[PDB]
Amino acid sequence: TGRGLSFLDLIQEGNQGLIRAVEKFEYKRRFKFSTYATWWIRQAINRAIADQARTIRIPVHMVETINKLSRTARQLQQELGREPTYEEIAEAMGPGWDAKRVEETLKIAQE
Amino acid sequence: MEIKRFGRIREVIPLPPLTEIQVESYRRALQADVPPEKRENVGIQAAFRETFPIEELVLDFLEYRLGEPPFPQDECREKDLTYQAPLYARLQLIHKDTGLIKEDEVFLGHIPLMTEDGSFIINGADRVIVSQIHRSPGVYFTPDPARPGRYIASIIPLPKRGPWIDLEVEPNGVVSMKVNKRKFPLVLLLRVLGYDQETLARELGAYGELVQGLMDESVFAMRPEEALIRLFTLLRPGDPPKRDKAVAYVYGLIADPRRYDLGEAGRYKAEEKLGIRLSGRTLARFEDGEFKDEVFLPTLRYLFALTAGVPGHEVDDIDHLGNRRIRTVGELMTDQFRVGLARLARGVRERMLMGSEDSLTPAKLVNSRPLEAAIREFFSRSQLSQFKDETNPLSSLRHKRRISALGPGGLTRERAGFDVRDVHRTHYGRICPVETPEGANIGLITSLAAYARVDELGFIRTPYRRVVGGVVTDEVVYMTATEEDRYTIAQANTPLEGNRIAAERVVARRKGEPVIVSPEEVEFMDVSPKQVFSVNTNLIPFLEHDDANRALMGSNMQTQAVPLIRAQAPVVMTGLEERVVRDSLAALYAEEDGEVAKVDGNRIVVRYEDGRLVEYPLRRFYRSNQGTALDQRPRVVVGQRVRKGDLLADGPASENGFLALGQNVLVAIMPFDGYNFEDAIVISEELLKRDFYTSIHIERYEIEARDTKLGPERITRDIPHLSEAALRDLDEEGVVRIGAEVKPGDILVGRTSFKGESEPTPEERLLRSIFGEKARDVKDTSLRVPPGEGGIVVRTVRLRRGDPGVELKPGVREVVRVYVAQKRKLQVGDKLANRHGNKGVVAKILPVEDMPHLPDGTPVDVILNPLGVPSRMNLGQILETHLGLAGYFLGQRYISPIFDGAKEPEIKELLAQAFEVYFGKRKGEGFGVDKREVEVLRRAEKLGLVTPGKTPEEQLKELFLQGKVVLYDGRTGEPIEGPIVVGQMFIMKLYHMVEDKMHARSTGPYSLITQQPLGGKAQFGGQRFGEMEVWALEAYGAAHTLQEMLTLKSDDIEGRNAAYEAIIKGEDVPEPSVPESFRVLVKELQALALDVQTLDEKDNPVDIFEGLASK
Amino acid sequence: MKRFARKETIYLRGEEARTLYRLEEGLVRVVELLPDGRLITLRHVLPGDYFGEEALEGKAYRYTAEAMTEAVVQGLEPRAMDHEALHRVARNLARQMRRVQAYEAHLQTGELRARIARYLLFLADTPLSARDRQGIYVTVSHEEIADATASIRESVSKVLADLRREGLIATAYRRVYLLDLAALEREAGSALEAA
RNA sequence: UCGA
């Protein structure tokens, strides 16, 4: 809850994931059903959040990138005891990332 | 000049620190200067202690610390940053199974710091957190409106910290408890608490057999567990009655200190009312597996005792200031901090399940985002967080001391009836009965009394002097209203010889009731009249002669006074004007004794006794929130010997350390050619000549150049299709040069933006071909001066991308700020007012030769109409005029304290002493009485003003003692047929000026959906023609005018285009068309599945969408 | 400072002469347009030359200035010039007087062939010229050559065709290559002042 | 929060 999707919506998409699990479940493996189901439900919920949470729709992998930028900035602000600069975030993101790309990513991610 | 102060009342104590209500509250909240181990359990500390330990792995709180601000206050204001300190918390994660302990210091974000003057800096702007009054937590008993002989018991916790429980005696005889809109028998909850029939019988048996109705066999039959399950099924239907769920729910509802918190004031009031002691701040406890009652039984007992009519039991007045408390900055901030902390705790608990159950630090477990978000929400978006009012020092000083009944966790405007807005008897010495907003906000917004302070419990206290026997001590006691109601308190003006009461009969109060009392019955005495009124009200001389309704306006308008360059202190002061300036912090004083080393416009260097050389920089021409100029000027010279607390530099709106909210002008009270009509004011051009009522104002302009998908916006001097005349005052980079004069239409900052793609019309093709000039890629987006504004450019600030120390929001390349200041002379339409509630707009500025004048040639400054006085009943301005005359001729100023000031005889004496100078000089100069003076004296004795038979000089003296003088009409030269009141009056220039309010619009911006013109001057909007105006036009039977308003001048697009074209072509305007908002209405009704069809007389469809909306 | 594209005008005849201009880069032509539609080149403005001279004496421009190349010009306020600026303006105006009078002499000296050769050699010493493998060249149209040799396009094209047949020059894409400087020099007789 |  709290990621932009209502409780009931998450419940329904989770139900869809449960359906997928039921269709894919192989009982011969002796693993309990909840084990297999949990992954599909989690996947369905995550996919739902990635898909429907924004008025301006953003591609799933791009959402992942945004979230990674978020967690990175959080870590950096946690170690530096203050909000990080674009250059610092670019450094922490590793290869391929400069300040321009971080800024553009933040701009694109604006709701 | 000489300063003569009146009044015999001696105040044993000076005014308290005026901003202490803010300062002490926030200081107590942060506990920054207190070492962590020695911190009391309050504020932030209390929040941490409440939130931790987080059980679920176990995370516990050790201690917190606050660092130093990364940037100073001035820097924060400059760079649009919040002034704040970093908050850290030492946390240890413990595994109870393993014994494992991992400890680390985590960064929880920043907390905003309060400045020296008791304000905050939020995103570069100064803000104030207004204290919020509300009902104090505790146990109350109110009369049941339905059933006269019965009562309702109300259990109130802190706001957002629990539900309200109601104890009622139902007509059927059973005692009901109301929680969360649900009612049930109290007997059940009592049974859950472990009560037995015997205990309830012996406890409640005495009270008139009321207990018998309460008793219920079925409830007592079942043990507390079954009763708990039963209660759970009653409160939460449909929810399976798991026993642990019931325990958890009931605990969380009543006994949980985390979900239910009575106030400290709540606990204290409960203990005091019920005569018991609480083990904690909860209504009950969960101890040794069961529930134990704390509050409920004493409240039920008190309820029964009240219903039975037992002596010593009373109902509670909910507007009484014993039952009403103040929530200051600290409490609010701590509350929101507590919320964010709870959210952070939720996040922690969620983090203590997922991930690896073995390897976890406190840094991984704690996310500070909810906390930072909660705090930022409180400071930025709360209603109690207001844009600081800093027109003058008194404005902000008052703003910080204001108390609001509105805001979150408090009254809405419809909720507030007569009871809450009323002035309670307990407001005496605590809440000012005078200073409150006129209109809808009346009684909701109030002001803290001068001598009042808010205690630790949140109740306002006021000081009183102890009186033992007939002797008045110098020891002062701050009392709450409840404790005040105990004693008999004599008035402060009661006659005294030494410390002994000199009156046989004194005026005193018992529970607010005025009474005549013998000196033996006098337990206490008022400290001063000043304690009864606010800071603003206490600055009003002759307040006793002013009707409260006007004094209100005076108080409120002092806030609106604009700082003048030649500003002076009033000739009639109350003696509070020094202290206001001193506490304001605007003015600069010397720390210790010493000698002044340097004096400059920009700075003052002082060498103290210690030998240390301290340099104080001075604030010069800074722009306040309301655009008034805050600037400090040095009042000392190099090598001057100064003492501790001596004035070094004067702040804004201050003269020699005294509050200067305006100027002292020579005023005459008389009608003038209808130019004085209905409170209007006439002024002399001489005021403009000597730069009186001239004020400096600075406006801030901003423009951003950002990256676009069409290419980068650039700030440059190169602007398409512009002459060199237009680009004249712009530098190489495109920014206007400092010191340049800019007028409406002039460019401040040049900017170009890449034109959006489009296809040129055939006309444009032909034109382009004719002139042989290619259409430019970029368009002129330059920031220009709006209509009615302009002035001298005093500053330029530029912030780019990729330069050290500066970073803008994403997408924004660069930001430029241009500060333009203007010298505003007093003009027609500007608003003036005095401290007595007399206010008016300047309608006419006459040349000096037209102005009425004294016989010696001295012209008056302001002409005020006498018709404004009698209906308003503010006579203070008259006395101020007389004493001002006396002071004008004697060349001195006065201090007239509140309610104990200069009375008539003394003013007459001063008037005589003044008359000696005003006349004796003339007689010595070899001049006698004038003919016109003789005629005026004739008409005067005809009016019974002077006694017949006395000499002309004696009669003129008799008139002068009445505050009236002979006045000559500057136009004719003939005198006014009667004696007229003339004297020095203190008049302020308010923040409302025509230059700011004048606005007009032909055509302009329209709204997105409605296609109607925008609102406000800032958007170049049109005026709103509302329902009542439409009613007016209908009543006039002006149908084409109304149709113009509804169509051509608004949302009729084709209509307005054709109308404009017709007017510029000299043609008459065409027939209007369908207003667009009606089409919007139709489509919006279609969205609601309703079919709206416009029909002709034949009932055939008419298309108002003109071929566009149907396939 | 302002940049202009080829064929774009800096100012038009009869328009307010509020601004004096100095050519910083490129080549500008000062021309007059007749009612019959004939265009005549009156004078050549080279980098450093001041033009829009009407701003110094009158209220409106009398002639039209057109950029022949990518050009960079500087706008100036006549009333705001100091001693040094007025000195530079005077000297430069004198230079332009000498060059426009020499141009006058050129327009009436020799047959069309000679005038064309002379104009080509003149353009060879202007920003209108450049160089590659084929040799030195000038970017100019036959129409402009006609406008600056007191003739019409057709005859100029004929003479240029003759020169192509004779091997003196080569032409393509409004671009004329001067292959034999000596021969062109002999044809022109007298040279035209380039500065 | 103002102003009327």
UniProtKB/Swiss-Prot annotation, chain B:
User: Belongs to which family?
Assistant: Belongs to the RNA polymerase beta chain family.
Keywords linked to the UniProt accession = DNA-directed RNA polymerase, Nucleotidyltransferase, Transcription, Transferase
Protein name as annotated: DNA-directed RNA polymerase subunit beta
Q: Source organism's superkingdom? A: Bacteria
- Entry-linked InterPro entries: DNA-dir_RNA_pol_bsu_ext_1_sf (IPR042107), DNA-dir_RNA_pol_bsu_external_1 (IPR019462), DNA-dir_RNA_pol_su2 (IPR015712), DNA-dir_RNAP_su2_dom (IPR007120), DNA-dir_RNAP_su2_hyb_sf (IPR037033), RNA_pol_bsu_bac (IPR010243), RNA_pol_bsu_CS (IPR007121), RNA_pol_bsu_protrusion (IPR007644)
Enzyme Commission (EC) number:
2.7.7.6
Organism of this sequence: Thermus thermophilus (strain ATCC 27634 / DSM 579 / HB8)
What this protein catalyses is: RNA(n) + a ribonucleoside 5'-triphosphate = RNA(n+1) + diphosphate
A GO MF label: ribonucleoside binding
User: Is the keyword Hydrolase in the record?
Assistant: no
EC class: transferase
Swiss-Prot record, chain C:
| Keywords (A to Z) from UniProt | DNA-binding, Plasmid, Transcription, Transcription regulation
- Note the superkingdom of the native organism: Bacteria
Cellular component GO terms, alphabetical: cytosol
Q: Check the record and name the Pfam families matching this protein.
A: cNMP_binding, HTH_Crp_2
The UniProt record lists the HTH crp-type domain at 110-182
Which CDD domains does this chain map to?
A: CAP_ED
Query: Does the keyword field hold Transcription regulation?
Result: yes
- DNA-binding region, as residue ranges, is located at 142-161
Annotated Gene Ontology MF terms?
A: DNA binding; DNA-binding transcription factor activity; protein homodimerization activity
Described function? Activates transcription. Positively regulates PcrtB promoter upstream of the crtB operon in a cAMP-independent manner. Regulated genes include genes encoding DNA photolyase, phytoene synthase and cytochrome P450 monooxygenase, which are involved in carotenoid biosynthesis. Positively regulates the light-inducible gene cluster in the megaplasmid in a cAMP-independent manner.
Kindly state the subunit structure of this protein. Homodimer.
What is the protein name given in its UniProt record? Transcriptional regulator LdrP
